[PDB]
């Protein structure tokens, strides 16, 4: 989930936008 | 600001800025 993808590895806009409503 | 390690409040803030009026969900356990 987000912590694995954006905190413990480098985030991306592609990935952040999956968490927008 | 997206293309780096984003933890805790820094992650929340990035979600807030990117998602804007759509809002977002923050689920650190999943």
Numbering used by the authors:
A (entry chain A): 1 to 21
B (entry chain B): 1 to 30
From the publication, what sentences describe this entry?
To demonstrate the versatile applicability of spitrobot-2 we demonstrate reaction initiation and fast delay times in three independent model systems, obtained by single crystal rotation data collection: Streptomyces rubiginosus xylose isomerase (XI), human insulin (HI), and bacteriophage T4 lysozyme (T4L). Using 12 crystal structures of three independent model systems, we demonstrate successful cryo-trapping via observation of conformational changes and ligand binding within 25 ms. Spitrobot-2 is an integrated benchtop solution for cryo-trapping protein crystals with a delay time of less than 25 ms. It is suitable for monitoring ligand binding events as well as conformational changes of main and side chains.
Human insulin (HI) is a 5.8 kDa peptide hormone produced by β-pancreatic cells, which facilitates the absorption of glucose from the blood into tissues. In its active form, HI consists of 51 amino acids divided into two polypeptide chains: A and B (21 and 30 amino acids, respectively). The secondary structure of insulin shows two almost antiparallel α-helices in chain A and a α-helix followed by a turn and a β-strand in chain B47. After a century of crystallographic research, insulin has been identified as one of the most polymorphic proteins, displaying a range of molecular conformations, crystal forms, and binding capacities for metals and ligands. Several cubic insulin crystal structures have been analysed under different conditions, such as crystals in 0.1 M sodium salt solutions with pH values ranging from 7.0 to 10.049 and in 1 M Na2SO4 at pH 5.0 to 11.050. It has previously been reported that cubic insulin crystals undergo a structural transition when the pH is lowered from 9.0 to 5.050, while their crystal packing is not affected. The conformational change of glutamate at position 13 of chain B (GluB13) is accompanied by the binding of sulphate ions close to phenylalanine at position 1 of chain B (PheB1). Here, we aimed to induce this effect by a pH jump with spitrobot-2.
